Amino acid sequence: HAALRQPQVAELLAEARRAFREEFGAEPELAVSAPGRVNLIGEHTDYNQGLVLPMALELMTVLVGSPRKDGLVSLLTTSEGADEPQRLQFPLPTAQRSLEPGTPRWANYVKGVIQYYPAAPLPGFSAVVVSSVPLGGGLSSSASLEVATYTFLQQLCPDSGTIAARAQVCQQAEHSFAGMPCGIMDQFISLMGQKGHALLIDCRSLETSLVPLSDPKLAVLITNSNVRHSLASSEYPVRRRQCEEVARALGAASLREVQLEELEAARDLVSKEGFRRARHVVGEIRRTAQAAAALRRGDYRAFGRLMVESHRSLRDDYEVSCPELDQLVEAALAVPGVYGSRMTGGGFGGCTVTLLEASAAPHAMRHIQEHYGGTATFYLSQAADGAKVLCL
Ligand SMILES: O=C1CCCC2=C1C1(CCCCC1)N=C(Nc1nc3ccccc3o1)N2
Ligand SMILES: OC[C@H]1O[C@@H](O)[C@H](O)[C@@H](O)[C@H]1O
């Protein structure tokens, strides 16, 4: 019932720097960071061209490296949880021979970003990878690794594209090298985060808006269920198809174009669970617009209520909660000073997010833990910077 330390960039950096020196016999030339994420509200909307309101965490991936002359890529990760081996070397992709997902799985993320990197000529490089983002724990550790990799390659071989195109490359790596067909939110927030802000993302227009979240009276408590059901992986793609089925049945580019009234009128053009999937999305888009407006005018009680409606919608209509997350959310809404709690991320495990009076965090942590059938982990996180570069 104490909050896990968030190592500052400097401490992850020093760790990365020391391990690079030992491994490659020289100081690294380059450092980059990319954070993980919590979604405050707007879940399972990004791939429906909806609205999301994520914020970057102090939990981050740091990559320190140097270009090579031999066209080789040599990687080391110190991340506990990374599958063996911790080291991998491979030649750069060419027109002849492209890179290929396999073992270790953590290198599929670097390989994917290298494979789809849009600028040339890319030299080889040596790199060490460290992360405080818990691996597969629901706060976008993969997006953080992809975005750190992309930022690194930018120093090796500057691209000339938009932040969206960069997000879309990281997203391509996730799809093609990790078999997770994600939307754009995780990569976009990892790129675009700013200290003291949430980011409202319009996943149709790709327009972004920085929204202040820096009030000392207020905290964001992230709770890790420290569970992941296999459905986290297998049912993600299923929901994407169900949403597509419903958009096609109504003659709509995306569920962004569909309102509840339009959806209710067409009940008999779609399945029962179809209709439930689409009721959540339409409702979550509306709620994210309302949450954004609420947050701007300091109305945390309204924000929290919209967080609770998002969870109920995800529980009952989208059916991507599990008993573990449900227990954690119920626990948190019992604590005075808590404005709202919901599951965040894909679901079927991972984290919940709780907006509360800062004074209440310790009482929330004790109570959530005591009421939770597993062992919860806690992060108290302010809104953090997106991808960053430090010349060494
Ligand atoms: O097995 C899964 C399925 C669900 C999502 C999750 C993966 C694994 C695959 C490799 C071993 C740990 C779990 N890793 C990530 N993310 C991540 N692994 C990293 C390694 C170093 C630095 C940053 C990293 O971010 N995502
Ligand atoms: O809100 C649900 C989210 O699930 C995420 O974990 C996925 O990577 C995102 O792109 C988004 O779809």
Curated annotation (Swiss-Prot):
EC number, as in UniProt: 2.7.1.6
Pfam families reported in the protein's UniProt record: GalKase_gal_bdg, GHMP_kinases_C, GHMP_kinases_N
Site residues by UniProt (Transition state stabilizer): R37
UniProt keywords, alphabetically: ATP-binding, Carbohydrate metabolism, Cataract, Disease variant, Galactose metabolism, Kinase, Nucleotide-binding, Phosphoprotein, Transferase
Sequence positions that bind ATP: G136, G138, S140, S141
Pathway connected to this protein: Carbohydrate metabolism; galactose metabolism
List of residues that carry Phosphoserine: S230
Family: Belongs to the GHMP kinase family. GalK subfamily.
PANTHER family: GALACTOKINASE-RELATED, MEVALONATE KINASE/GALACTOKINASE
Subunit-level organization: Homodimer.
Protein name: Galactokinase
Organism per entry: Homo sapiens (Human)
Taxonomic path: Eukaryota, Metazoa, Chordata, Craniata, Vertebrata
This protein's encoding gene: GALK1
